[PDB]
Structure formats: structure tokens, C-alpha cells
Scaffold this active site. Structure first.
Site, PDB file in Angstrom:
ATOM      1  N   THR A  34      -6.808  -0.560  -1.891  1.00  0.00           N
ATOM      2  CA  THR A  34      -6.207   0.632  -2.480  1.00  0.00           C
ATOM      3  C   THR A  34      -4.708   0.397  -2.633  1.00  0.00           C
ATOM      4  O   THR A  34      -4.166  -0.555  -2.072  1.00  0.00           O
ATOM      5  CB  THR A  34      -6.416   1.876  -1.592  1.00  0.00           C
ATOM      6  OG1 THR A  34      -5.896   1.619  -0.282  1.00  0.00           O
ATOM      7  CG2 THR A  34      -7.891   2.222  -1.494  1.00  0.00           C
ATOM      8  N   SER A  35      -4.042   1.266  -3.387  1.00  0.00           N
ATOM      9  CA  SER A  35      -2.605   1.141  -3.609  1.00  0.00           C
ATOM     10  C   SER A  35      -1.802   1.510  -2.363  1.00  0.00           C
ATOM     11  O   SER A  35      -2.304   2.190  -1.467  1.00  0.00           O
ATOM     12  CB  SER A  35      -2.178   2.028  -4.779  1.00  0.00           C
ATOM     13  OG  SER A  35      -2.850   1.648  -5.969  1.00  0.00           O
ATOM     14  N   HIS A  93      -0.613  -5.288   2.058  1.00  0.00           N
ATOM     15  CA  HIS A  93      -1.760  -5.089   2.923  1.00  0.00           C
ATOM     16  C   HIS A  93      -1.847  -6.396   3.695  1.00  0.00           C
ATOM     17  O   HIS A  93      -1.285  -7.409   3.271  1.00  0.00           O
ATOM     18  CB  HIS A  93      -3.039  -4.931   2.106  1.00  0.00           C
ATOM     19  CG  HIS A  93      -3.191  -3.590   1.460  1.00  0.00           C
ATOM     20  ND1 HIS A  93      -3.138  -2.412   2.173  1.00  0.00           N
ATOM     21  CD2 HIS A  93      -3.461  -3.244   0.181  1.00  0.00           C
ATOM     22  CE1 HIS A  93      -3.369  -1.398   1.360  1.00  0.00           C
ATOM     23  NE2 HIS A  93      -3.569  -1.876   0.145  1.00  0.00           N
ATOM     24  N   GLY A  94      -2.544  -6.390   4.821  1.00  0.00           N
ATOM     25  CA  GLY A  94      -2.666  -7.626   5.567  1.00  0.00           C
ATOM     26  C   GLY A  94      -3.700  -7.600   6.668  1.00  0.00           C
ATOM     27  O   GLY A  94      -4.342  -6.578   6.915  1.00  0.00           O
ATOM     28  N   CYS A 135      -0.540  -4.808   7.958  1.00  0.00           N
ATOM     29  CA  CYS A 135      -1.454  -4.700   9.086  1.00  0.00           C
ATOM     30  C   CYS A 135      -1.767  -6.086   9.619  1.00  0.00           C
ATOM     31  O   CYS A 135      -1.711  -7.074   8.882  1.00  0.00           O
ATOM     32  CB  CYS A 135      -2.748  -3.999   8.654  1.00  0.00           C
ATOM     33  SG  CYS A 135      -2.394  -2.332   8.107  1.00  0.00           S
TER      34      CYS A 135
END
Ligand SMILES: *CC(=O)[C@H](Cc1ccccc1)NS(=O)(=O)c1ccc(C)cc1
Ligand SMILES: *CC(=O)[C@H](Cc1ccccc1)NS(=O)(=O)c1ccc(C)cc1
Lengths: 146, 93, 93, 146
Positions: A34-35, A93-94, A135
Site C-alpha cells: 500500500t502507499s 516499506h521494509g 519496518c
């Protein structure tokens, strides 16, 4: 001269160095990601903050995994002789040890390896700072009342 | 006559290993908000590790998640400073 | 009103993530030798993160492996400071 | 009183705290692990070093994975109210995120979890230091000439 102690990095080179900010907000549908709303706030805050510290800031937005690697490689190939340090900020993100390009993952080790003391000689002996906003897993900290 | 190829790296992680990293759609991520605030206030006064320690305290004490989803409600976060630096770092000289 | 359950932890690793950790059968491990030496010399003078930074420099510059086995010869090591601390730490008061 | 700044941990409690040193030198044959010669040098160096910092040192030698967990659990259950901090030093073979008991592995997370702010209330808000002398993998650093 008098007693010389080398307890702090030499930060008086002509330039403080580069500050590369990679801001990924939009991800390809197939990634199922997601954004990341509000990430531009971080990008702008970082740009101003490091500008005031005299870093040559370069903002990049929505880079694919291929573009992230290409960018890091090219940057590590620049001549940093007159620069005191290097800063790279990753906003995305991660997962543990991974940062996401808009179309897939990039191992953090692949990114940082370009700057190893033996691979980027003009940065050898100089501080290489990687700031990671992503993350590192799924765990949530419930905290404890004090 | 040599130094480690992994020496002189500093990794300022927004969260602890294995953990989620929180962000506010309006104010930005908890970590970056705090990092920029502490750099603005202390970069001409404190050594970098000490600035990052202030960031750790700010994120740890001033932020807590709010969610309609009980799973993600009332959660906390602690950043993670990983240093392979060999000297103190001051942004000023 | 709460703090992270992972807050206030400091992990002083002898080596970088994924790396081997060197020891000398006679003098002890490179990291512990250096850590004890720096604590003995600076515990009543420097904040803990700064003491550990001196340890990083000592291990990184003063040690190198010697082995008849080319695979393990002339290798280096950099310790890894992982801090989730929220305040500065001095062993004295 | 005058301006009060809480930038440093309160280290003037009646006791500095415990310093638990786990020294594993001999490993069970089935583990296929070899002995760690010279580790006693480290154990003794640490005992003296922390003794001078006024820590209550407790040395333990050749503990099985079960004994390490039992020890950590029991220690986390003690009343640390009058102690400023906690220190644990692990000397053994290891892998990323793992420390070895004489007969098998122990996840570092299992050890440190006993001391989480919500699980060891008498240490909440106090520094918990874990010093780890063990491999975190097989990689070797070739270094770079300076
Ligand atoms: C915190 C974080 O970035 C992810 C959210 C995410 C990232 C990439 C793609 C979709 C969603 N959350 S997580 O709980 O750490 C997580 C969610 C899903 C997977 C497969 C791994 C981790
Ligand atoms: C550095 C280290 O502790 C190990 C040596 C070892 C540890 C436990 C049991 C036998 C040998 N070396 S390593 O190169 O990091 C390594 C060797 C063998 C395995 C299965 C994992 C890691």
C-alpha cells in the site's frame, strides 16, 4: 605542535558531503504494497534539516529496486575526496535487513556494500551514515506504564 | 596497517530489530520527526551518539499509536542505534 | 504514560552482523581485551557510548589475524554497538 | 530546586547492580563444537574490571542451554529495586542472534526478553547491558590498507 588526540572525525573538509534521500511512497500493485501517506513530510523535513548542516542534499522519489542499486553504485563511484562524510536516508516499506523499491526488495547489505572501506576509497576512514525509516518486521511493542 | 571494511558505518534505525515502524500521515514518521527535531536543536552542541540517544528518548516517551483496530492500538516504539564508528562525530568544528 | 518494553537495552556486540569474532588463546578475545582496557582507562571519565567507540577503534586498528590457513589470515574486526538506551550512561556519579 | 535535566541515567542507587558472566569453554561432542581456549582470560578480566566499577559479579562456567535460560529467568525474578543497572556478559560460540550453551543454542531474544520493561519491573527505566563475545556468522573482514 602540542599533544594531538584523534578522538573525533575530521569534519572540516571543504564539503560536509552528500545526503541522499530516497522517498518511496507509491508501490506497484503486484507487490501488494500500500502507499505510504505523509512520507513527503519526512522528505522535506530531512532536506531542510541536512541543508542547515551544510550537506549537499539530493532527493529521489519512488525508485524501483533497480534504480536504488544503480543510484547507490553511481554515488559510491563519485570522488568524495573533498567531503567529510556521507549520509543516506531511506524512507520506505521494509523487513529485517530489507528496504523496498517501488517494485521489489533491496537487501540493505547490497546498498551499504558499495561504500565499504575497500570499495569506496574516497570515503575510507570517513563516517558513512545510513538512516533507515522502515519496518524491520511485524512485531508490535505493547509498552509498559511508568 | 589496515582497518575493517565494515568500519566507520553508523546505522540509525527507526525501530528495534523485528519491529514495526510507526508513521503519522500528517506529521510524518515518529522517528524522522524526532531525528530532525533533535538535530535542529543539538547538532551544534552534542556529539552524534548523544543526539541519537535524545531521539531514542523522544520517540520512546512522546509517541503512542491510536487505532480503531485493537491489534495496532496503544503501541510504542524504540529506535535502534547501530554504530561501527571509530571516532566521535560532531557536525560542527 | 508508557515506555517501550524494548527500551533501555544496550547490546555491545564483539563483531558486525554476520561476521566471525576473533579470539587469541593467550590474550583473550580482541573485543573483551579492548573493552576491559577502555573501561579501566575511561569509566570515570567518559559516557558509555564514547567508551565503546574507543573500543571500536582499538579493535579495528590494533588487531589483525595471523593464520597458516590463507582463508583466515590477515583478517580484521569491527565491534557493533547497538543502543536502545534513552539516556546517557556514566558509571560514576 | 533549580533547573532539572534528566539526560543521564540515575546511577547512584545503593548498588550498581549485577554483572552476570557466562563463560562457555567446553562443548558437548554431539554439537560438533570445539573448545574455546583462552576464554578464561576474558572471564577473569571482566570480573576484575566490573568489580572495580562496583558491580556484584557472578561468574558461571560451561552452562547448558537449559541452565542459561534458568539462570536468566531466576536473575530477572530477583528484586533489583536498589540496583542502578544490570549487566550480562556472554562468552561462547554463536551465530547471528544465537549464543551457544554447552549442549545447544539459545536465542538471544529468549535471554533478553526476561528483562523487558514489562517483565522485570524492578529494572524498568534502568539500563540493561548485554555484552556479547560470540560469532554472528561466518563472514571474514579482509580489511583495507590505510
Ligand atoms: C511496517 C511495514 O512496512 C509493513 C507494511 C507493508 C510493507 C510492504 C508491503 C505491504 C505492507 N508491515 S509488517 O507488519 O512489518 C509486514 C507486512 C507484510 C509482510 C509480508 C511482511 C511484513
Ligand atoms: C566463530 C564461531 O563461533 C564458529 C565456530 C563454531 C561454533 C559452534 C560450533 C562449531 C564451530 N564459526 S562460524 O564460521 O561462524 C560457523 C561455523 C559452523 C556453523 C555451522 C556456523 C557458523
Amino acid at each position: 605542535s602540542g599533544i594531538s588526540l584523534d578522538n573525533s572525525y575530521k569534519m572540516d573538509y571543504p564539503e560536509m558531503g552528500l545526503c541522499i534521500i530516497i522517498n518511496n511512497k507509491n508501490f506497484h500493485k503486484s507487490t501488494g504494497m500500500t502507499s505510504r501517506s505523509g512520507t513527503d513530510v519526512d522528505a522535506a523535513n530531512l532536506r531542510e534539516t541536512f541543508r542547515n548542516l551544510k550537506y549537499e542534499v539530493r532527493n529521489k522519489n519512488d525508485l524501483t529496486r533497480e534504480e536504488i542499486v544503480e543510484l547507490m553504485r553511481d554515488v559510491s563511484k563519485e570522488d568524495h575526496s573533498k567531503r567529510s562524510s556521507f549520509v543516506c536516508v531511506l524512507l520506505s516499506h521494509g523487513e529485517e535487513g530489507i528496504i523496498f523499491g517501488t517494485n521489489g526488495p533491496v537487501d540493505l547489505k547490497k546498498i551499504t556494500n558499495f561504500f565499504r572501506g575497500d570499495r569506496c576509497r574516497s570515503l575510507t576512514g570517513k563516517p558513512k551514515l545510513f538512516i533507515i525509516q522502515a519496518c524491520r518486521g511485524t512485531e508490535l511493542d505493547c509498552g509498559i506504564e511508568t | 596497517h589496515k582497518i575493517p571494511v565494515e568500519a566507520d558505518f553508523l546505522y540509525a534505525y527507526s525501530t528495534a530489530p523485528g519491529y514495526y515502524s510507526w508513521r503519522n500521515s500528517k506529521d510524518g514518521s515518529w522517528f524522522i520527526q524526532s531525528l530532525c527535531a533533535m538535530l535542529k536543536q543539538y547538532a551544534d552542541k552534542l556529539e552524534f551518539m548523544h543526539i541519537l540517544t535524545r531521539v531514542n528518548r523522544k520517540v520512546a516517551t512522546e509517541f503512542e499509536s491510536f487505532s480503531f483496530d485493537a491489534t495496532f492500538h496503544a503501541k510504542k516504539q524504540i529506535p535502534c542505534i547501530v554504530s561501527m564508528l571509530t571516532k566521535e562525530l560532531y557536525f560542527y568544528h
